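User: Could you write out the 3D structure of this protein bound to fe (iii) ion? I've included everything you need below.
Assistant: Certainly. Input first, then the structure.
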Amino acid sequence: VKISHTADIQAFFNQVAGLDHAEGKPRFKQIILRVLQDTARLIEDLEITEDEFWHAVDYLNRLGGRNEAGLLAAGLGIEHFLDLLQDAKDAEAGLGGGTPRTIEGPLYVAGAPLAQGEVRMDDGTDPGVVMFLQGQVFDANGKPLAGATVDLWHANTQGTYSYFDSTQSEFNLRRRIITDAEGRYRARSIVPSGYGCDPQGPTQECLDLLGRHGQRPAHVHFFISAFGHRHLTTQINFAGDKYLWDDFAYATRDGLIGELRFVEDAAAARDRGVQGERFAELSFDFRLQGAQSPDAEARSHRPRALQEG
Amino acid sequence: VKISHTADIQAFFNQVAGLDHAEGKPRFKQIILRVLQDTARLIEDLEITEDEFWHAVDYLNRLGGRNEAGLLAAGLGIEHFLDLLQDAKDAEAGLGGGTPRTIEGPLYVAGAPLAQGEVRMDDGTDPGVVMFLQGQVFDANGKPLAGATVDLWHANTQGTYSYFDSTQSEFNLRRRIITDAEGRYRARSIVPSGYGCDPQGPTQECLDLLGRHGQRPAHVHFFISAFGHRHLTTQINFAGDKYLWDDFAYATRDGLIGELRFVEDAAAARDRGVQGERFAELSFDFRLQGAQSPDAEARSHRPRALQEG
Ligand SMILES: [Fe+3]
Ligand SMILES: [Fe+3]
């Protein structure tokens, strides 16, 4: 039984959307008219039962109250899909950039501590592997851009991010590094762990029904931007991780894999500001695009922890 | 730019849905494959911006955390739409019932105090108008059904429901009345007020953008069921309410309007177990349908406050 195609019902969705008056935005009205016609068709095409419909509405309350809506768009590949479409859109406008882009994720936090060229990122709490992170920011041509900001955040060895994990100290593993004259950034930190969604959370309960896992490879998030250049959201995925190419949020891309190198020496005392038995080294450069508007460097208006806007 | 129609993207949604393995439910897989193809098309057909997309994901967190998902399906006419489809479905199976059905609403609470034939519903707290509620439960033929349960709940004079409003006492304005030999129920209570959504809540902020109001007429909710009869969810809407036929959840239907009668007498001392100056009287009967399965009386599995199932 299909009633959604009758004028009787199109007239009803019409008034729900608000086309019954002159207040509100003629934009949502068009979007809600659409969201309603489509929602109705699924229900009629897949014959969703009342029980299915109401468990969805309720799941939706729980997804909301654990605050995992961004985590689910990510797990359903919706976030990756947007970058694909952003890419196809750039192909048309002929904006063949430098470093590829990849999903942002739901765990960013504004205003992290700021530093010139060098910074240590960890609070010296963990039994991790020190990781030395370094590279340059490049221009459209292949040149050093002094003064670009590389905004980075990553999980700790337990695989969690500060701020959401209260056990962690303020902005742990979170910093804004300013590139120096040679356009480089240096970061002393720790190898982050891959992580999974909360096993008893809304996102995973959905993935379970999909028969899917909710794991991600060890990675490091970046927000890179420079006066007169196009803002870039990307990640460095660590080489060798079991999930490198099986990420539940499908963010891993070619050219986005970091090659990690291990240096072993019980006594790394002299030679590099280290001390012993082992540490990681990783170098990765970002190449930006010429901006063609202030819009270019500006981050989405996506809401984020602490941007208080 | 449309990429959603390419095999490259259909293959991607395919693996997201979980068709990449043998675990999970082949049902969600089909539903999520669909929810993803459609979501993608809106984005491509209405050219939703990244900012729009991410404010929606965030709105979705707030809708979840105030727990108004049911209140929004109601405001967008989604709940009414289901009863319409349930109706069209009954027309085919030739189930031309008694009293029409109408949306349940998001504020039911299980296990309310139980009573034989008569009960008082209020805790004697308000400066309301006493309301006398009475009627019978009828069979498919027009006869009294002794022993049917009429499960009712309604707002108080401030226009709120107990349980969600902590200021109210336990199960205030909430009861399960058992019909007597003559198949009737009697209820001494108070005239409820119409109510609006929370003005600074997720639902209303949406309706605002639709230019719409979030008000409902004064009403009384009913769950009516009897051994061997089809369970009915309905409302009685009070006559004369400004919003009788302008309900933001579109529940008002013909044959669902209660005709309220006012009796005035400073001294209603003797004659009816009253006392003075004014009270309301309302009589309404429910006519049920022959059940043709236990499914018939069983309430949806819709999750509800306290059913602890
Ligand atoms: Fe992450
Ligand atoms: Fe109500």
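Chain B touches chain A through 72 residues (CB under 8 Å).
User: Perfect, thank you.
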